[PDB]
Write an enzyme that holds these catalytic residues in place. Structure first.
Site, short mmCIF file in Angstrom:
data_model
loop_
_atom_site.label_atom_id
_atom_site.label_comp_id
_atom_site.label_asym_id
_atom_site.label_seq_id
_atom_site.Cartn_x
_atom_site.Cartn_y
_atom_site.Cartn_z
N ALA A 45 0.66 -1.13 -0.04
CA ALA A 45 -0.08 -0.16 0.27
C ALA A 45 0.90 1.51 -0.07
O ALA A 45 2.01 1.20 0.32
CB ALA A 45 -0.83 -0.02 1.41
N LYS A 46 0.17 2.33 -0.44
CA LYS A 46 0.90 3.69 -0.71
C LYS A 46 0.23 4.50 0.52
O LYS A 46 -0.82 4.78 0.66
CB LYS A 46 0.71 4.25 -1.97
CG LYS A 46 1.67 3.41 -2.96
CD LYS A 46 2.79 4.70 -3.25
CE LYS A 46 3.55 4.26 -4.31
NZ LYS A 46 2.90 3.74 -5.43
N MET A 47 1.37 5.01 1.43
CA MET A 47 1.05 6.08 2.48
C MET A 47 1.31 7.51 1.92
O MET A 47 2.48 7.65 1.96
CB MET A 47 1.68 5.59 3.69
CG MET A 47 1.63 6.35 4.80
SD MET A 47 2.38 5.31 6.21
CE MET A 47 1.72 6.41 7.77
N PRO A 48 0.48 8.19 2.29
CA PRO A 48 0.89 9.79 2.23
C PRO A 48 1.91 10.24 3.08
O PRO A 48 1.66 10.08 4.32
CB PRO A 48 -0.59 10.43 2.21
CG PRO A 48 -1.66 9.44 2.08
CD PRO A 48 -0.99 8.11 2.58
N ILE A 49 2.64 10.87 2.60
CA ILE A 49 3.82 11.25 3.44
C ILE A 49 3.66 12.54 4.33
O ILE A 49 4.51 12.76 5.11
CB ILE A 49 4.93 11.48 2.63
CG1 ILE A 49 4.94 12.91 1.72
CG2 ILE A 49 5.23 10.56 1.69
CD1 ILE A 49 5.87 13.44 0.75
N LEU A 50 2.60 13.14 3.95
CA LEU A 50 2.34 14.36 5.04
C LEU A 50 0.61 14.08 5.68
O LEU A 50 -0.04 14.20 4.80
CB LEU A 50 2.51 15.93 4.26
CG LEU A 50 1.93 17.02 4.95
CD1 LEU A 50 2.68 16.78 6.19
CD2 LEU A 50 2.54 18.11 4.18
N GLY A 51 0.97 13.92 7.04
CA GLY A 51 -0.54 13.80 7.32
C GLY A 51 -0.90 14.76 8.50
O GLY A 51 -0.18 15.56 9.01
N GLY B 117 -1.60 15.35 12.50
CA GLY B 117 -1.59 14.70 14.00
C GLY B 117 -2.91 15.47 14.74
O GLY B 117 -3.42 16.39 14.21
N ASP C 64 -3.45 11.15 11.38
CA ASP C 64 -2.93 10.11 12.47
C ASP C 64 -3.71 10.33 13.71
O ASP C 64 -3.80 11.37 14.39
CB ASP C 64 -1.54 10.48 12.85
CG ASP C 64 -0.97 9.66 13.99
OD1 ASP C 64 -0.54 8.52 13.44
OD2 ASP C 64 -0.53 10.27 15.00
N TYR D 22 -6.08 9.72 22.62
CA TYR D 22 -6.28 11.09 22.28
C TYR D 22 -7.57 11.67 22.65
O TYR D 22 -8.04 12.68 22.44
CB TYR D 22 -6.02 11.50 20.74
CG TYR D 22 -4.44 11.08 20.33
CD1 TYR D 22 -3.40 10.80 21.34
CD2 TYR D 22 -3.94 11.16 19.17
CE1 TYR D 22 -2.26 10.52 20.96
CE2 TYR D 22 -2.75 10.95 18.68
CZ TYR D 22 -1.59 10.41 19.82
OH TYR D 22 -0.63 10.02 19.21
N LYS E 299 -3.78 3.49 16.78
CA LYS E 299 -2.88 3.16 17.60
C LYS E 299 -3.51 2.37 18.77
O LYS E 299 -4.25 3.01 19.53
CB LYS E 299 -1.88 4.01 18.18
CG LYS E 299 -1.54 5.14 17.17
CD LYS E 299 -0.28 5.91 17.67
CE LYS E 299 0.03 7.16 16.67
NZ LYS E 299 -0.98 7.98 16.77
N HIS F 118 0.97 1.66 20.13
CA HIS F 118 1.47 2.92 20.42
C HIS F 118 2.89 3.17 20.99
O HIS F 118 3.57 3.92 20.77
CB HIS F 118 0.32 3.51 21.04
CG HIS F 118 0.10 4.98 20.94
ND1 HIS F 118 -0.98 5.56 21.30
CD2 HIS F 118 0.93 6.01 20.69
CE1 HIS F 118 -0.88 7.03 21.25
NE2 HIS F 118 0.24 7.14 20.95
#
Ligand SMILES: NC(=O)c1ccc[n+]([C@@H]2O[C@H](COP(=O)([O-])OP(=O)(O)OC[C@H]3O[C@@H](n4cnc5c(N)ncnc54)[C@H](OP(=O)(O)O)[C@@H]3O)[C@@H](O)[C@H]2O)c1
Ligand SMILES: COc1ccc2c(C(=S)N(C)CC(=O)O)cccc2c1C(F)(F)F
Ligand SMILES: COc1ccc2c(C(=S)N(C)CC(=O)O)cccc2c1C(F)(F)F
Ligand SMILES: COc1ccc2c(C(=S)N(C)CC(=O)O)cccc2c1C(F)(F)F
Ligand SMILES: COc1ccc2c(C(=S)N(C)CC(=O)O)cccc2c1C(F)(F)F
EC number: 1.1.1.21
Length: 316
Positions: free
Chosen positions: A11-17, A19, A44, A49, A78, A111
């Protein structure tokens, strides 16, 4: 810059997410909605949280509005420390899924390598100020995580705050079914993590950098602590590019082939923080920022230092 990175599960994960730690429930739905509008696809999250319901509202609204489809989103959560027992893992994940109103997560992480006493409280402590551990171990929790893949609840599993020997314990596990796809760790110019990053990349494990702005809203921040956003040397690099210091701090891990997850609940900052695909840090910028490493953590978690699995005693 390509906006996704390939994971060892295909799978491909976006490098800017985006938080979401410390994002108040009352602001995080708007935050996630604006993030999706301006191009974020990776969010994320975490049960601890205590805002996954409100993140869920945002995602559902953007799906309903036809702004994005589920397949384009990359949602990460997590497994909290109090749920490391194998018999508690599926319910912890399904609580997250039910709160997010999703039927799978793109990525589910352990986590912290440290299991805590199971029960209602999230951060059980004793009269010495130390955490109350659980009798859980990394390998058995990892096996429980694997089951989540095989039941269709998560597409990828990974870890967070693991040092390289703890990663190796999993890579060496008898009858390992899935390698970790990601190690999410603190990382920024004052904590550049070269050795742990090299280890993970050498193994095919993608690194996510957390607290990339130095988590100035962390509860334990003290006035004498170094501060990335106010560091004049980073301001000077930002100035050269007619960018903000945050933007420099976000682009920095991008150019190290890491994923990064800056947090904000301020719509203007959310938009600013994503506007980092239209400039490049120079080689001078990159090596100068690396040269500012102090091996200094904003997330040391001193209350946990006696736990048998505390991760930051090892060199990396
Ligand atoms: N896996 C773990 O153990 C772990 C640990 C820590 C963090 N994380 C993840 O990493 C994410 C990022 O780390 P973090 O939340 O510790 O901190 P961070 O992203 O380093 O910093 C967040 C802080 O910076 C402020 N800010 C954001 N953009 C700004 C900008 N452009 N200009 C000025 N100030 C700005 C935010 O303010 P406003 O929100 O008020 O705008 C907030 O005070 C977390 O939210 C969480 O998702 C994971
Ligand atoms: C469960 O633990 C929580 C839950 C919420 C927070 C928040 C949140 S989102 N708020 C206090 C809500 C708000 O700011 O209105 C901020 C900082 C640390 C938190 C923590 C932390 F433990 F880190 F202190
Ligand atoms: C800073 O400490 C906080 C802050 C907020 C919470 C919440 C949250 S975010 N709120 C009660 C909701 C809100 O403040 O709006 C839920 C559970 C534990 C928290 C904690 C706690 F530490 F108890 F875990
Ligand atoms: C592993 O130990 C942790 C880990 C995280 C926390 C946090 C959290 S939720 N963060 C630092 C954010 C995160 O871990 O993502 C807040 C309060 C105590 C913690 C503790 C501890 F309770 F021990 F202090
Ligand atoms: C602001 O609220 C804080 C602040 C600090 C803690 C810590 C401590 S002292 N830290 C996370 C600091 C550290 O251990 O380094 C441990 C457990 C819960 C906390 C909480 C919590 F609310 F979760 F109880």
């Amino acid at each position: 810059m390509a906006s996704r990175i390939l994971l060892n599960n295909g799978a491909k994960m976006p490098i800017l997410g985006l938080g979401t730690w410390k994002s108040p429930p009352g602001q995080v739905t708007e935050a996630v909605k604006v993030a999706i509008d301006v191009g974020y696809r990776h969010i994320d999250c975490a049960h601890v949280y205590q805002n996954e319901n409100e993140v869920g509202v945002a995602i559902q609204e953007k799906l309903r509005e036809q702004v994005v489809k589920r397949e384009e989103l990359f949602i990460v959560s997590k497994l909290w420390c109090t749920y490391h027992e194998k018999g508690l893992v599926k319910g912890a994940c399904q609580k997250t899924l039910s709160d997010l109103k999703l039927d799978y997560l793109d990525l589910y992480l352990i986590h912290w390598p440290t299991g805590f006493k199971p029960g209602k409280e999230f951060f059980p402590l004793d009269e010495s100020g130390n955490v109350v551990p659980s009798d859980t171990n990394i390998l058995d929790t990892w096996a429980a995580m694997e089951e989540l893949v095989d039941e269709g609840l998560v597409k990828a599993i990974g870890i967070s705050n693991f040092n390289h020997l703890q990663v190796e314990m999993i890579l060496n596990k008898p009858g390992l079914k899935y390698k970790p796809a990601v190690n999410q760790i603190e990382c920024h110019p004052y904590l550049t993590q070269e050795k742990l990053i090299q280890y993970c990349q050498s193994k095919g494990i993608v690194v996510t950098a957390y607290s990339p702005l130095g988590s100035p809203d962390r509860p334990w921040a003290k006035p004498e602590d170094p501060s990335l956003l106010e560091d004049p040397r980073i301001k000077a690099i930002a100035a050269k590019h007619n960018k903000t210091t945050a933007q420099v701090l976000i682009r920095f891990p991008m150019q190290r082939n890491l994923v990064v997850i800056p947090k904000s609940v301020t719509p203007e900052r959310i938009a600013e923080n994503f506007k980092v695909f239209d400039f490049e840090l120079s080689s001078q910028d990159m090596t100068t920022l690396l040269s500012y490493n102090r091996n200094w953590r904003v997330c040391a978690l001193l209350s946990c230092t006696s736990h048998k699995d505390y991760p930051f005693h090892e060199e990396f």
